[PDB]
Amino acid sequence: SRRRVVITGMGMLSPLGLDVPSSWEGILAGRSGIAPIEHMDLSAYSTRFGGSVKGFNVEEYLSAKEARKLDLFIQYGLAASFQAVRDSGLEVTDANRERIGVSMGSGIGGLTNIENNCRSLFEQGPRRISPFFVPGSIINMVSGFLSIHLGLQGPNYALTTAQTTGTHSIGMAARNIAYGEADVMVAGGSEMAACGLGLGGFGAARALSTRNDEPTRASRPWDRDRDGFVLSDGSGALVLEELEHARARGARIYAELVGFGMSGDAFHMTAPPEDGAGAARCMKNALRDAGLDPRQVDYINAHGTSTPAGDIAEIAAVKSVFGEHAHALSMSSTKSMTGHLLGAAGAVEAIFSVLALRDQVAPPTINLDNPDEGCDLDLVAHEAKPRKIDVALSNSFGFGGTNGTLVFRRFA
Amino acid sequence: SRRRVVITGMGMLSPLGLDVPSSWEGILAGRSGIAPIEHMDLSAYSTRFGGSVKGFNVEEYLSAKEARKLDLFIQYGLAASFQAVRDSGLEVTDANRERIGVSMGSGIGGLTNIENNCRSLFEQGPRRISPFFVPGSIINMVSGFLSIHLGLQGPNYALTTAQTTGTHSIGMAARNIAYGEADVMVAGGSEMAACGLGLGGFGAARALSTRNDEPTRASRPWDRDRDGFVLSDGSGALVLEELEHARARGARIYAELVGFGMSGDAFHMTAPPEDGAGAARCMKNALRDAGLDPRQVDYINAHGTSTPAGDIAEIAAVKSVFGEHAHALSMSSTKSMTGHLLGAAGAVEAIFSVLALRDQVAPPTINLDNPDEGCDLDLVAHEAKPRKIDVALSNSFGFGGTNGTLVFRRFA
Ligand SMILES: CC(C)OC(=O)c1cc[nH]n1
Ligand SMILES: CC(C)OC(=O)c1cc[nH]n1
C-alpha cells in the first residue's frame, strides 16, 4: 500500500496575476491576460502578442545581485516556489530537511539568456559572456537555488517534457512521497520563452495564432475559427505532502492527489493521432492508478491549446474513455484566458483544478462562439459554471507525443 | 511490492569509440580521446581542445533527411538508444509496447542548433529560423523520437540535472520498473555542448583546463597539477528490465541495479562542500536502498572531474562513508580518458561500472602522476587493475548541489 499525498501550498505567476488568488479571480471572471508584447521589436514576426507576466518584482524574493545571475524562467519558478512554501506554513528543521525535496521543471528553459549571450558572442567575441551564463540558464537551477535558499536536502531534480513538464513534475513528486522517498516535495514548472527564438521558433512551425488584430480572442479552444496556440509566460508550484505528516502539524489541505498517468503516442514529433489514442491510454492509466470508475469524474481541465488537430483529438479521447458519461462531466480550457504557458501549463492548471474542487465551480472556456464539428460536450462556454465536483482531472500533451494526467479528489 | 531491475542492453558514443566494445577497449588500454577541436575556430578562446565523437555516421541509424532536422545531442541519444535496444534482443509487440518507456536526458540540450538559429535571427532575421528549431533542439525529443521510431508507448520523459542527468535518468527509470509503472525502460543521456556558447560559458567561469599544449594530459583527477575539467561529447543508453520479464524471455543479463541515491547539497550554485557532505549522504542513501554493508563495495567509478574542489570533496566523502574499508576498495575516474560528458557522464560511467563487473577489472585513472594531499586511496593510477568486483558504485554531482549514486552487483 502506498502513502496518500495531499496539497498544502500553492504559488503562481500568470498573465492574470502575480499570485494564485489574483489569477483565480481572473479565471472565474473570464478575463484574458493576452496583449501585444512590449518588451521587444516584433515587426518582422507573424505573431506580436502573448501572455506576459505584468509588474513582477523579483526584489520581493531575491537581492538585485542574486537576480542578475538568473534567467527570467528561473526567477518565475523561484517566485511560485517561495509562495507555495509560505502558503503551506511548513517549518524546515534539522529533523526534516532530508525528507523535503524539489522537482521544478521547464519545457524550453533559458532561451532569453542564451539569446542575450549570442548577441555579445557574435558582436564582441566570447570574452563578453557572463561567468553565470551556464548555472544562470540551466533548467535544474530552480530546484538547486530553492534547495540552497531553504536548506532542502531531499530528492533534488528537474523534468523537461516540453508542454507536459508541469504535470509530469507534480505526478513524479507524488510518487516520491507515495513510495516513501520523501515526506514533502515542491513541484511544478516555469517558462519565459517570449524571445525571438521562442516566437520565431514556434512561428516558423506555423504553430501560433496570428490574430494580431484581436489578441484576447486569439485563444479559442474547440471554436471553428481557431488558428493555433498563444505563447504565455509564468510559473506554478505546489507543496505535496504525505497525509499523516500534514495532519500531525495541523496543515490546511486543499485536495488529495489520488491518480497519475503517463503514456507515449509513439506517433509524430508535433501532431497527435486524430482519435487521441495516447491521451485515452493516459487518462485510463490515471483512473486505474486512483482506483476510480470513469463515471466518478466531474471536471476535466483540458490541454485545450486552440490548435486545429489537438482540440479535436482531445474530444475523441474523452468520448472514448468516458462513453455516455462524456456528456455529464464538464470540460474547459483555462488556456482560453491564460494562453499556453508550455512547461508551466500543467503546474498552473493543476492549481486551477484544485481550486475548482475547493470552490465547486468549473472555469469557463472563453471565445467558444461556434463549437466545431463533434465538439458537443459541456465545454463551459463563455461563463463559469457552479456545479458539484468530487473528482477533477488535468491533462497535458506535448511534442514527442508525451502525455500526462493528474486526478485530484475532495479531501474531508 | 518492489520488483528487481537488471541491465540487458547497453549502447554508447564516446571520445573513445562509436559503440560500447570499442569505447571499453580504449578504457582498459588507458587511451585518451582528448584532442584539439577541429570543427570550429577557437583562437579567441582560453580552451581549444576536448573529447569529440570522431567519425560518427548518423546514416548508420537515420536518413540524412531526418538527421538534418536534429541537433547532434539528439542524433547521439538515438544512436546509443538504438544500440542498447538491439543489444537487449527485446522484440517490441502489441502485447508489451505499453510497458516499454524511455528516459533519455541532457544537461544543456540543443545549444549548437540554438547558436546556429541565433546567428540566422541576428545576421538575417526571424524569417530564417528553422521550422524544426523547437522539436530539433528541446531536451525531451531523444525520448520523443525514440518512442516514434520503435513504437514505445510506456512512460516517456526526460531529466535535466546538469552533470548528474545520466545517473538520475537510469535511477528513476529503475524506480518506474520496480514500482510496476513499466517492465522495460531505455535510460541514460546525451550531450553536445562544444560550440561557442558552451566553451565560452564554461571558459567565462574558469571551470575548464587551459592545458592547450598537452590536451591528452589535461584531465588528471586527484593530481596536484589539475586545473579544471575537459569538455566532452557523446551518449550512453541502457535497457533496464524487470528480473522475471528478463528471465521469462531468456535475456542475457549484464548485472543487477540494486541501489539508487539522490540528495541535495543545499550549499552553493556551482561549488561542492569541502567535506563532500552531500556526496556522503547520497552514497549512504544508495547503500541502504541496496540492503548492503558498505564493506561489500569493491569498485567506485568516481565523478572525478579534475577540478581542484570537486576531486578532494569526493575523497573526503568516500573516507567518511567507508572508514577503514576506503583503503580496500578501488576508485577510478574514467574522465581521465573520456573527459566530462556532462549530462551523459553518468550514462557512459554506469556502462563502465557494469563492464567492470562483467570483466572483473578496475579501469585506470590515467595522468595521476603526483596524487594531491590526502589522495592516498587506491585510485588505480596509470593502468587497469584486475581484481574482485561483486559491487560497483557510480557517483555524479552537479550544479545546484544535485547528487546521484547507482549501485550495481553481479547476477547469477
Ligand atoms: C500536442 C500534440 C502532440 O498532442 C495533442 O495536441 C493531443 C491532443 C490529444 N492528444 N494529444
Ligand atoms: C559538481 C559540484 C557541485 O560538486 C562536486 O564536484 C562534488 C564533489 C563531492 N561533492 N560534490
Give the technique used to solve this structure.
X-ray
A127 in any annotated domain: yes
CB of A403 closer than 8 Å to CB of A279: yes
B283 in any annotated domain: yes
Indicate whether A298 and A184 sit together in one domain: no
CB of B394 closer than 8 Å to CB of B350: yes
Indicate whether B335 and B243 sit together in one domain: no
CB of A99 closer than 8 Å to CB of A87: no
Nearest-angstrom CA–CA distance, A232 and A209: 12
B1 in any annotated domain: no
Indicate whether A303 and A255 sit together in one domain: no
CB hemisphere CA count around A204 (13 angstroms): 20
Query: Which residue among A259, A279, A295 closes a domain?
Result: A259
**Which residue, among A65, A195, A402, would best test binding to B if mutated, counting the most B CBs under 10 Å from its CB?**
A402
A378 in any annotated domain: yes
Indicate whether B189 and B228 sit together in one domain: yes
Cα distances (Å, whole numbers) of residue B163 to A109, B232, B305, B385: 16, 12, 10, 27
**Which chain B residues have a beta carbon less than 8 Å from that of A196?**
121, 126, 129
Question: How many angstroms is it from A346 CA to the middle of ligand 1?
Answer: 14
Indicate whether A324 and A253 sit together in one domain: no
Nearest-angstrom CA–CA distance, B287 and B298: 13
Q: What is the largest CA-CA distance in chain A?
A: 64
**Which chain B residues have a beta carbon less than 8 Å from that of A100?**
none
A1 in any annotated domain: no
Residue among B121, B138, B161 whose CB faces A107 most closely: B138
Helices of type H across A263-403: 277-290, 308-322, 335-338, 345-359
B193 in any annotated domain: yes
What is the tally of structural domains in chain B? 2
Indicate whether B311 and B197 sit together in one domain: no
Query: Which residue among A259, A279, A301 closes a domain?
Result: A259
Indicate whether A193 and A266 sit together in one domain: no
Query: Which residue among B232, B259, B286 closes a domain?
Result: B259
B394 in any annotated domain: yes
CB of A75 closer than 8 Å to CB of A58: yes
**Which residue, among B153, B165, B206, would best test binding to A if mutated, counting the most A CBs under 10 Å from its CB?**
B153
Resolution of this deposited model, Å:
1.9
CB of B313 closer than 8 Å to CB of B375: no
Nearest-angstrom CA–CA distance, A201 and B128: 10
C-alpha cell of B203? 571558459
Nearest-angstrom CA–CA distance, A20 and A348: 9
Nearest-angstrom CA–CA distance, A129 and A304: 40
Helices of type H across B89-179: 111-123, 133-137, 141-150, 165-178
Indicate whether B221 and B272 sit together in one domain: no
- List b or e across B23-62, with b for residues whose CB sees 16 or more CB atoms inside 10 angstroms: bbebbbebbbbbeebeeeebeebbbbbbbbbeebebeebb
Residues of the domain holding A194: 6-259
Write out the DSSP string of B13-48: EBTTBSSHHHHHHHHHHT----EE--SS--TTSS--
Question: Can you tell me which residue has the cell 498552473?
Answer: A348
Whether B399 and A134 lie within 8 Å, measured CB to CB: yes
Indicate whether B58 and B143 sit together in one domain: yes
B392 in any annotated domain: yes
Residue among B148, B158, B162 whose CB faces A138 most closely: B162
CB of A224 closer than 8 Å to CB of A215: no
CB hemisphere CA count around A286 (13 angstroms): 35
Indicate whether A140 and A227 sit together in one domain: yes
Indicate whether B238 and B376 sit together in one domain: no
For chain A, the residue count is 412
Helices of type H across A111-228: 111-124, 141-150, 165-178, 196-204
Indicate whether B200 and B65 sit together in one domain: yes
Burial grade of A214 (CB within 10 A; 0-12, 13-18, 19 or more): exposed
CB hemisphere CA count around A246 (13 angstroms): 23
